[PDB]
Amino acid sequence: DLAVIGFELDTRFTNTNRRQRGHLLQTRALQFRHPIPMHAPVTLPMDTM
Amino acid sequence: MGNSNANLLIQRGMLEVSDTIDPAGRLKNLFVLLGGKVVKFKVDRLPRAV
């Protein structure tokens, strides 16, 4: 039965008529907010005299 | 503020308008009831906990 039975071609369309877009690009932005906390103090007591 | 440790620490009625909350706060922990028992999630540093 030695014979060629089928084939596949590596053909493609040309988008001179822009039928296909492919992947899309868009711009994005994210924000991170980092407010600074206040921390507990350290004190040096004295004598008011 | 009224239910904070500040009032129950020394005298119950210390709090006055001179005290304020620091705006720089975060959601420190989130407790979920998972199938009848509680699981503690540490979420303090997540970008959406601020």
Side-chain angles (χ1 to χ4, degrees):
Chain A
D1 61 0
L2 181 64
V4 177
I5 63 170
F7 63 98
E8 293 182 324
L9 307 174
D10 191 19
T11 63
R12 61 187 68 190
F13 293 92
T14 56
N15 293 330
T16 59
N17 183 305
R18 194 188 306 172
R19 179 169 55 79
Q20 298 291 69
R21 292 187 293 175
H23 290 293
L24 305 176
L25 301 178
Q26 295 184 27
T27 61
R28 295 286 185 268
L30 301 168
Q31 299 84 44
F32 304 81
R33 296 182 177 90
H34 294 287
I36 300 167
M38 183 177 288
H39 303 262
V42 56
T43 299
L44 175 60
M46 300 179 288
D47 186 327
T48 60
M49 293 306 294
Chain B
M1 294 175 71
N3 289 278
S4 70
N5 61 310
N7 283 335
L8 295 175
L9 185 65
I10 301 171
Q11 295 181 332
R12 293 171 68 88
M14 291 189 288
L15 188 69
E16 63 178 3
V17 300
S18 68
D19 292 320
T20 65
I21 297 170
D22 186 351
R26 295 177 183 269
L27 175 63
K28 184 176 180 180
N29 295 301
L30 193 148
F31 293 71
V32 178
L33 181 61
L34 179 66
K37 292 171 74 74
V38 177
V39 175
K40 183 178 180 180
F41 292 92
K42 183 175 182 291
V43 296
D44 57 331
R45 304 302 301 171
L46 296 176
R48 294 183 182 278
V50 64

